[PDB]
Design a protein around this nucleic acid. Structure first.
Lengths: 52, 104, 124, 108, 134, 51, 101, 44, 202
RNA sequence: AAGCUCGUAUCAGUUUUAUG
RNA sequence: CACGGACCAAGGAGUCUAACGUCUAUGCGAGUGUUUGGGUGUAAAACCCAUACGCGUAAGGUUGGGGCCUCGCAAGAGGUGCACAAUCGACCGAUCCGGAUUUGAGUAAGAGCAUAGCUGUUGGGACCCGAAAG
């Protein structure tokens, strides 16, 4: 059980990967190249009023 | 995504597949489901605005202490626009056939 | 059309001593015994696989009738072949039911694609 | 032999819970005790200032309250510590005076 | 005697995809130098502390040259006095970044260097110190 | 890019409001890094096992 | 910008891609010409694109451009096309004008 | 009513090259047709 | 101004069109203001369709110059253009360079058609172009050839005598080409654009 | 294998030529 | 020669970790490391971070010399020359009275830290199975 089950990852760098992950939520052809029938959404980033 | 929960999360918690995250966190595993980029986000209006506070731009500083978003190695991502530019195309000898002609 | 299709070697390679023993199977494997006859290539023994048998990049992967093979499940999948009816021919992965095959059939003749394995699971 | 702590996830949850009960009874009080401001030894660290154990007799006196009462008002007292540095003494006294002025006390 | 950089990093794959081209059509030596020094490893790209730049511009005509470092530029506080220059390289330590732009200079990626100076006309390429490591 | 974004109502139509882009959408995409950070970060929830 | 969206599609996966037994790999997108996702046919990394597609009616030429790139719900423009094969072809190479060959 | 203007610069530079080479075509006809003389007289 | 910038950038057709209108009814009534207007427009061109309108605007932003006071107003107002455009130039797309080269033309032609009014003024116009031709050598390449051709577009066989009388005047162009010869004769420059000029001076 | 500081302008299980 | 094999099925042997490495990638860069600990949590995850501590931070003259610039269609010619190479001056901890030799991957202008990956040495049962005694 003392097999390493976990990995330490630089913090700064990890924010790098978060930053990028958000960025791809924009380009709107990455939203397709993953999954996501999005073709009928009105606009991207799809932004809905706070009222939700 | 949202910013401050006024009671959304309970509405969506049941409905299949849908899932929310406060902006203060943004779970990578829910942005990039398997390292295939691009979750499909519905930001809300407040959170979208929060999103400068969180990360920060040339004006608003950080809120994640001592941080800045990454730089760029290129200036501009799309390359062909460099190469098919008039600004290179005047520096370079002319072209070939792109499919040569079998000799002998 | 296409060139004339040449296999360079048409006989499946077998594993040394496959038949004299069952505890040995027919899937080719190397001989690491430095004494062995099949490794040092003595006359009259079986023929190793070796790269030179590699077939002709033009006709490689071509089924005999001249098309290639592309393996489809539902009709929405064969619609990718609207363009190439002259190169690829498509056949129907085994687990498809007898319910949907007949659909892939009708629609696959309309498009004019060759289905290598019709008559699978279908009577009249 | 080899101990490997897989509960560093859980132990912190039970430590949050512990403090969550210790404030489920004592609720008005602040879980804690006022503590002096104390300079460290050893030419290496002496420039740093630190948390100590308890204020003192004297620091408690000149701050206008008495030991045995202090301990019950939230202060914490350490009887084996010796006030010398004027400045440290000052910051302490001040820190109490503060604490006094900020607290309340209920009746009985 | 190499082909493609060791890297996963997309953006120097688009650089490389640019500089192969440029090197091929323009047939200038500049491109072969810069590219042929791009594919190197991380040990082989010593970072160039900006004090070495300030050293380098102390020669003649150096007012007009865009000095170039394939590596990263890393500022050094051992200089308070820095020229007006224009630098192009891959990565800038934000320290160096703000140091130059404060001092009057300009700092721009390799792409923009190509667009500006495809022949690499009137440029300079500094190699970071090499053996100083183990 | 785009200078600004159109909020939508819950009925789904447009709205007079407009929002700048956060300029986090200017940041590089790095399918590499996402892939490494996401193998390492994905490993971090594992209950142990042994025999 | 687009070349990146490509390279992402050329290393990670598209939701849609096939990889036939020989080396070549289709693209099952509803909207594309040629049905092979490669640099110049994959509708997801182009930003300028045109195909032809049946409605169950006649064959609408669908077109897109960069400008509706961010507005997918309506991005593809659409045109019908005549029943004159001749006139059709003239309509096609009509609308496409300096769209590349 | 439609001027694409990207293709213009190309059509000019293209054109100039094509008629720079057609030079080398004719001049190369003169070159070769010349050679088939000298080399012959020297074979004799 | 901010309401202009944002009603032009607002991504929709309507808000953009009607914001154009208003600005026309406006400029009848400093450097920073003008920059802001540009970036407004620059993003108002970003959107376009089906190229006929894509042209129609290129006119529009041309016409917009047609509106020693206005001397100053529109010399500064164009300085804004050349600055914002050579700045936000190189971050453009590959496919858009269509529009912004077209527009870069209709503009330059519109600065001329104004400065053709009566023709000092001109000298200061070259006291922006001078300030500006000599970064991103992509654009001078364009204004060189398009310079001369579009100029011939102004003055509109014997027609060539109509020009070469009118251009036989040759003074404004004499000073323009004086700006080119300025940039060539120097020693530190593109080394490309130099060559390209020496193609198109001739 | 790796670096670059060569493809420099590098030699050779060889013959010669003069000195054993 | 000598050892194994009657045959079939199934099982069956370079693993894990720790300490030092070499390389490659990655993030930052005179810094460098969030994860003992706090806070928050949609709860063994994600996100945030105070104070410390680990490792690092102790310009000469010439000559050649990738690139560059100029002339030259061209070979070549002239100028500037980064890396380091070498040349003879230099500063420093240790050399007998500023020196006779040196000095130490010391300064002369930094290059490191951390994680991943392939691997290598060492101990752990350490590729699997089999020594007698104690």
């Amino acid at each position: 059980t003392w097999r390493k089950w976990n990995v330490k990852v630089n913090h700064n760098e990890k924010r790098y990967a978060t930053a990028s992950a958000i960025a791809a939520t924009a380009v709107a052809s990455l939203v397709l190249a993953r999954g996501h029938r999005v073709e009928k959404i009105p606009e991207i980033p799809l932004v809905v009023s706070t009222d939700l | 995504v949202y910013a401050e929960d006024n009671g959304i999360v309970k509405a969506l918690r049941n409905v299949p597949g849908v899932e929310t995250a406060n902006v203060a966190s943004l779970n990578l595993l829910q942005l990039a489901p398997g390292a295939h980029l691009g979750r499909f986000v519905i930001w809300t209006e407040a959170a979208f605005t929060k999103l400068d506070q969180v990360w920060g731009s040339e004006t608003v500083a950080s809120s994640k202490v001592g941080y800045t978003l990454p730089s760029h190695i290129i200036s501009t991502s799309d390359v062909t626009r460099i190469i098919n530019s008039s600004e290179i195309q005047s520096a370079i000898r002319p072209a070939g056939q792109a499919t040569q002609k079998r000799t002998h | 059309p296409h060139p004339k299709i040449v296999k360079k070697h048409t006989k499946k390679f077998k594993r040394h001593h496959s038949d004299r023993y069952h505890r040995v199977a027919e899937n080719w494997r190397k001989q690491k015994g430095i004494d062995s006859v099949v490794r040092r290539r003595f006359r009259g023994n079986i023929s190793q696989p070796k790269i030179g048998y590699g077939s002709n990049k033009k006709t490689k992967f071509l089924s005999p009738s001249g098309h290639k093979t592309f393996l489809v499940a539902n009709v929405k999948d064969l619609e990718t072949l609207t363009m190439h009816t002259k190169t690829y021919a498509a056949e129907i992965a085994h687990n498809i039911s007898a319910k949907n095959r007949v659909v892939i059939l009708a629609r696959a003749k309309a498009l004019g694609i060759k289905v290598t394995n019709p008559k699978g699971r279908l009577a009249l | 032999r080899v101990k490997v702590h897989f509960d560093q996830a859980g132990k912190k949850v039970s430590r949050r819970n512990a403090r969550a009960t210790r404030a489920a009874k004592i609720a008005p009080r602040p879980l804690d005790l006022l503590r002096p401001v104390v300079r460290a030894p050893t030419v290496k660290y002496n420039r740093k200032v630190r948390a100590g154990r308890g204020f003192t007799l004297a620091e408690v006196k000149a701050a206008g309250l008495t030991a045995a009462y202090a301990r019950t008002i939230g202060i914490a007292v350490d009887h084996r510590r010796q006030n010398r540095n004027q400045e440290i003494f000052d910051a302490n006294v001040q820190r109490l005076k503060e604490y006094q002025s900020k607290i309340i006390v209920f009746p009985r | 005697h190499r082909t493609a950089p060791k890297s996963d990093n997309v953006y120097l794959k688009l650089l490389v995809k640019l500089y192969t081209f440029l090197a091929r059509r323009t047939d200038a030596p500049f491109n072969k130098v810069v590219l042929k020094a791009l594919f190197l490893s991380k040990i082989n790209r010593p970072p160039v502390s900006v004090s070495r730049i300030a050293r380098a511009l102390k020669q003649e005509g150096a007012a007009n040259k865009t000095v170039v470092v394939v590596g990263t530029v890393t500022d050094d506080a051992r200089i308070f006095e820095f020229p007006k220059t224009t630098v192009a390289a891959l990565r800038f330590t934000a320290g160096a970044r703000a140091k130059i732009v404060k001092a009057g200079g300009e700092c721009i990626t390799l792409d923009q260097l190509a667009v500006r100076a495809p022949k690499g006309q009137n440029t300079l390429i500094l190699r970071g110190p090499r053996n100083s490591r183990e | 890019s785009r200078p600004q974004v159109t909020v939508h109502s819950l009925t789904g139509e447009a709205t007079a409001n407009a929002l700048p882009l956060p300029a986090v959408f200017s940041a590089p995409i790095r399918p590499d890094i996402v892939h490494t950070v996401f193998t390492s970060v994905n490993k971090n929830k594992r209950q142990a096992y042994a025999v | 910008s687009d070349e990146i969206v490509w390279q992402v599609i050329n290393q990670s996966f598209c939701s849609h891609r096939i990889k036939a037994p020989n080396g070549q790999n289709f693209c099952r997108n509803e909207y594309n010409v040629t049905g092979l996702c490669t640099r110049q046919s994959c509708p997801l990394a182009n930003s300028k694109y045109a195909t032809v597609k049946c409605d169950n009616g006649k064959l609408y030429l669908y077109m897109k451009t960069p400008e509706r790139a961010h507005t997918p719900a309506k991005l593809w423009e659409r045109i019908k096309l005549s029943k004159n094969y001749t006139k059709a072809l003239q309509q096609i190479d009509e609308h496409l004008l300096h769209w590349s060959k | 009513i439609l001027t694409p203007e990207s293709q213009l610069k190309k059509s000019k530079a293209q054109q100039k090259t094509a008629e720079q080479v057609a030079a080398e075509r004719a001049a190369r006809k003169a070159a070769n047709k010349e050679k088939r003389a000298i080399i012959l007289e020297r074979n004799a | 101004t901010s309401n202009f910038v944002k009603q032009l950038s607002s991504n929709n057709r309507k808000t953009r069109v009607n914001a154009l209108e208003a600005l026309k009814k406006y400029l009848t009534a400093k450097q920073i203001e003008f920059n802001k207007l540009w970036k407004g427009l620059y993003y108002a061109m970003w959107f376009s369709d089906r190229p006929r309108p894509q042209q129609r605007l290129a006119n529009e932003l041309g016409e917009l110059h047609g509106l020693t006071t206005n001397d100053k107003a529109f010399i500064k107002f164009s300085r804004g253009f050349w600055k914002v455009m050579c700045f936000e130039w190189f971050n453009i797309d590959r496919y858009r360079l269509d529009k912004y080269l077209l527009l870069i033309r209709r503009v330059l032609f519109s600065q001329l058609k104004y400065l053709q009014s009566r023709n000092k003024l001109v000298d200061e116009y070259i006291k922006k172009v001078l300030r500006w031709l000599p970064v991103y050598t992509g654009i001078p390449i364009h204004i060189v050839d398009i310079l001369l051709d579009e100029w011939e577009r102004l003055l509109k066989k014997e027609e060539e005598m109509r020009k070469i009388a009118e251009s036989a005047k040759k003074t404004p162009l004499a000073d323009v080409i004086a700006i080119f010869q300025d940039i060539v004769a120097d020693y530190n420059n593109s080394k490309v654009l130099r060559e390209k000029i020496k193609e198109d001076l001739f």
